[PDB]
A paper describes a structure:
The pilus consists of a flexible tip fibrillum, formed by the adhesin FimH and the subunits FimG and FimF. The pilus rod is a helical assembly of up to 3000 copies of the main subunit FimA, terminated by a single copy of the subunit FimI that anchors the rod to the assembly platform FimD in the outer membrane.
Next, we analyzed the process of FimA subunit incorporation into the growing pilus rod. Using a local refinement approach, we obtained a 3D-reconstruction at 3.5 Å resolution, capturing the usher along with FimC and the last two incorporated subunits, FimAn and FimAn-1. The overall arrangement of the subunits FimAn, FimAn-1 and FimC in the FimDHGFAnC complex is similar to that observed for conformer 2 of the FimD-tip complex FimDHGFC (PDB-ID 6E159), but subtle upward displacements relative to the transmembrane domain of FimD are observed for several subunits. Specifically, subunit FimAn is positioned about 4.5 Å higher than FimF, FimC is moved upwards by roughly 8 Å, and CTD2 of FimD is shifted upwards by approximately 4 Å. This previously unknown FimD conformation appears to be specific to FimD-rod complexes, in which another notable change occurs in the orientation of the Nte of the FimAn-2 subunit emerging from the usher pore. This adjustment appears to still be constrained by the upper rim of the usher, preventing FimA from adopting its final orientation found in the pilus rod. In our FimI-terminated pilus complex (model XVI), we observed a similar interface, however, this interface is also present in the FimA-bound complex (model IV) without major differences (interface areas: 266 Å2 for model XVI, 263 Å2 for model IV).
Numbering used by the authors:
A (entry chain B): 20 to 159
B (entry chain A): 5 to 159
C (entry chain D): 116 to 187, 194 to 453, 478 to 613, 617 to 803, 809 to 833
D (entry chain C): 1 to 92, 101 to 205
Write the structure that this text describes.
Amino acid sequence: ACAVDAGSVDQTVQLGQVRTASLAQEGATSSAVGFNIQLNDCDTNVASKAAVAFLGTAIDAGHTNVLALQSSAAGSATNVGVQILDRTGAALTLDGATFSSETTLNNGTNTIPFQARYFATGAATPGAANADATFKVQYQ
Amino acid sequence: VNGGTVHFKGEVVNAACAVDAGSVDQTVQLGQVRTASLAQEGATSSAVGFNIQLNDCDTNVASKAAVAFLGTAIDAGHTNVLALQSSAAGSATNVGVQILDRTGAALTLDGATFSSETTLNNGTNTIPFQARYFATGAATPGAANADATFKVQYQ
Amino acid sequence: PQAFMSNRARGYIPPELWDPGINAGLLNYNFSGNSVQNRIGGNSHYAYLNLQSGLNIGAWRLRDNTTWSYNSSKNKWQHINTWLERDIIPLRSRLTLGDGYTQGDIFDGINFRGAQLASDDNMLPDSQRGFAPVIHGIARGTAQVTIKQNGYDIYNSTVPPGPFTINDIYAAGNSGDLQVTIKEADGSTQIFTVPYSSVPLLQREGHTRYSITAGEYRSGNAQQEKPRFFQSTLLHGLPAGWTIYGGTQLADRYRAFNFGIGKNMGALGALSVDMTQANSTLPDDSQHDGQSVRFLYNKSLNESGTNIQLVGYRYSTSGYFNFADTTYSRMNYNKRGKLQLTVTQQLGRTSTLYLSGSHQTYWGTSNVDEQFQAGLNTAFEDINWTLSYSLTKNAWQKGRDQMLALNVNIPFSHWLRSDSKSQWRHASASYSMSHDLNGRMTNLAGVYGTLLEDNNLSYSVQTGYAGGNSGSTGYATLNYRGGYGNANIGYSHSDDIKQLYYGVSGGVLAHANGVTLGQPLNDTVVLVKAPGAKDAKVENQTGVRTDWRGYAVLPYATEYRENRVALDTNTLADNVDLDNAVANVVPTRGAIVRAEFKARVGIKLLMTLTHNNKPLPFGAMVTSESSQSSGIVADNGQVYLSGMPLAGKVQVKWGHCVANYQLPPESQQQLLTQLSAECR
Amino acid sequence: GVALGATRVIYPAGQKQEQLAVTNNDENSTYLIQSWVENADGVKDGRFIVTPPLFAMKGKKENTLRILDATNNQLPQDRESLFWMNVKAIPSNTLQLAIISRIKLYYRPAKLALPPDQAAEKLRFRRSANSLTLINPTPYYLTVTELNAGTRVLENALVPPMGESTVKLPSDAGSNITYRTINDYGALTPKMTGVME
């Protein structure tokens, strides 16, 4: 079979700078930042379709589709998390078993796009937002 | 069958409050001067109330911002009386506008700042003031429009 | 009354402000190459070039995809997809001709080649997206409404004495308790609460989504044929928390009709039931008629924001097949029941236990496909650790098939000081251990981070150890996101294998102002054009710099939204001043929008002008036709000018004066020059 | 009404230009923005030049003000320096109001003996009759907020680096002191207690 492309194993995404005006109330979202997961040596015969599932810590039980930012020495932002969308534009549940939309595996290089976004659960205090997530790939 | 990790790094920065003063163009309307009423120094006019809103910002940053009024004083004795700013046939004599506080105490125009004590109205944080014409000896039938400056020290 | 008034949603953008884009070509290339050296088979070279062409003329967007593969032994250009997309504003929909996919959720995902017209939700404002209750009320007297969540306020406004409907409430997660509090100036406050729970099939009140797809069927498998088909999908959000959703899938041999209802029961949760009735002719001449019922339940937040449960059941009677089973070859066991049970439980503000259980039984084959997954992710300070367990017992004798995983991420900022200037601050240590519950061990410990000024150069060096075999696999990767493309190089070392990966990705736009290169594109792109401003980095994006002509292309821009494009003035040549360093563009899906900037290239000057030994008054305009520059006198006759020659003259219009000036070469080399020049 | 990007602009030493965003949320409003920089005594100064000093903003728009340095390395490199950045929005019978927004410009030397994190805790309190003098040895301007001496707030204080600020304390207050300083980004550090050292 195939595997995740080299260098896409551990990835970093710079969401940038967002303001409380953009994230002032529950449900407010920032501008999505795109990032792709690359797969190599995936033949059509061995695996026709594939999808990924992101595993992460939810900020609260009510919002299980958004992540939780880690505390920092300088200070961590409050009432805000990171949300991972899909190609269709829908949020992804961070459960280990909830996979994303299927894609057709072209022979050779295959890139799957995603968008990281900010999701504020109430008023967002200023700070630094750093979040982590683990993704697993299934082949069909 | 297995993958790795993706990390997201970013910054959330506080934004200063947007200041809205009364109507558009930061303009507050006042009643016309009454020649008969504006006779003596103690003679006054209608105290038109207005308010300043600190919107598009958190309720914590607005409450910690000091507030002051400043401008040009018409006379050394009339410290709290704004000098009317009009150069035309509509310029009036021995008049001016006064900016007051919540209770009705005169606000110093030197620049000495004070707390905001913002009231958290359903929309945003608000600070109310009043403006009233203040006769200083005589009245002239002219539009005694003036100008004032609002100072907000974002602590 | 607010109900009769045409109040617009929060964050609403008029359709007239939407930018269709520009008429420009497009070409995204992705070349990858792997040199694999093994002691048994010498060395070999693999190459794959993925080329996505495209053309945006008018509003139509033509896109084509091609692949080229090379081994070291022949060249094979292979088309994949070609589609002409467009957006229709009056219908609030998107049309697509040619290849594509069916985004159907009521039916199964289908790849096709034909014409699809489907309603799009991204064109709606972000406020009225997803599911959120609409509040209908009648206010006696002028009142102020504060619809507030269990945590904080959401919607605060003023309502006149009459009927009022509020539909601007955000999604606010899966479950929510919205308390509507109206305060009249005269009467006492009136409060009432409404709880809600969401399911993806639920829609807002008076919200309609439709999809009409027609054309041939395309699949990767060669065995499956290519029959023509039609597919209609409808999703309507009825009043009072109901949803009516149906569909129809028709072909030569397969005719299916889907009907279903969903409900928001409030405190209890959310429900969705649908039935699909299908008459399908199998690959053989035999005909089969069947029905399949899908049940879905979503419980609300049990305890106090601790547990959420999802139960998805599906019963497919003997004789229900999907469209693939019909479209198999001329000559080529159904699912009796599928149960999915998901329980999420948050504890200690740190750990999030996720439990998932799937249980699928077939017809005749009594063997069951059980699948259990238990994940536990915790984030203690900067440390982020995760322990996962999986257990799969399927029909085809998979046995126990257990797995255990442990992943730990430790940032180096946990030890480095807050204001450290060392490059080690942008680094982390990742450690992963995997047991197969059989002795199969997989360790992988490594470092990764970014080590460039703009954090473009991302490095990742990880060693590992796979033990039953005992193979210590090293792994190293360097990615570079520059202003002309993405270049990645990797070296994967094993016991007797050495792989060398190297790839370059990029995008090219042949717009009216020539050819511009940049990072690989992603649907919508913004072309920043600031001629005369070479090597000026744009803000909030990594490694996006203008080329030697001042043209650059942004990879991603949010569609139908207000997105800011700013040029970082700090990293800009001291000889150039931008009239506007921030621009706003609202692009359409797959559109190239120009964010034009004006840049003055001459020296930056600050002039003190005195007229008759008296400084110029406030507000006077000082312009200069020698280099087309303008400025406004600030105070004391001080004016700021950008883009000015060394020796020149300016003209001031207070309500007609001329001022001459000359400057030394040290002044032209200075960042900002200050001089005094008496005016006529 | 115009708004600034942040309530606190920190300019590190060794640079030349620091950028600050000015935005206009009102869609239908014409403004004239005039900005400048004053020293710690509220006196107009030429040590920092804001460009463009005066410009016209039409409607809803965002511009960037570039603060150019002119210190010539004449400022001390031991402790932070304080300046006040003023931005005035002229709304070009009725009295018109021009809003002046004042923010703290922190000239921060490149190398400092202490990171900003631990500057908040090291703030010892000198307590006596009708006085609660705050001593700050760390080289950072400390913004003490909600100074609760047991059951009453005193006021917001700004303690200079390596300096002792003074606050008048009513005698009815208790011995317990709790405070919280505003950090770099403008948020409030979680409430700490205060020693009497």
